[PDB]
Amino acid sequence: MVVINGVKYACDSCIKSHKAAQCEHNDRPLKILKPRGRPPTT
Ligand SMILES: [Zn+2]
């Protein structure tokens, strides 16, 4: 996975899987993520 400033990211084959724990792939579409969030309502 990758992180910038205070943002997180990883391949769709990790962030969606779990390997993101230490993703280091190249190909494949990347994505972003953060330390939990949750909706404002539901
Ligand atoms: Zn990956």
GROMACS .gro file of C-alpha atoms and ligand atoms in nm, residues 1 10-15 19-20 22-28 30, ligand 1:
model
   18
    1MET     CA    1   0.000   0.000   0.000
   10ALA     CA    2  -0.343   0.052  -0.267
   11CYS     CA    3  -0.425  -0.162  -0.569
   12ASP     CA    4  -0.782  -0.279  -0.615
   13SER     CA    5  -0.636  -0.625  -0.570
   14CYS     CA    6  -0.525  -0.541  -0.218
   15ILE     CA    7  -0.736  -0.265  -0.067
   19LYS     CA    8  -0.284  -0.787   0.111
   20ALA     CA    9  -0.280  -0.409   0.105
   22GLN     CA   10   0.196  -0.438   0.238
   23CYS     CA   11   0.080  -0.406  -0.121
   24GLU     CA   12   0.367  -0.346  -0.360
   25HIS     CA   13   0.218  -0.431  -0.698
   26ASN     CA   14   0.250  -0.209  -1.003
   27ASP     CA   15  -0.009  -0.296  -1.265
   28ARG     CA   16  -0.377  -0.286  -1.176
   30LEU     CA   17  -0.495   0.193  -0.761
   43ZN      ZN   18  -0.138  -0.469  -0.435
   0.00000   0.00000   0.00000
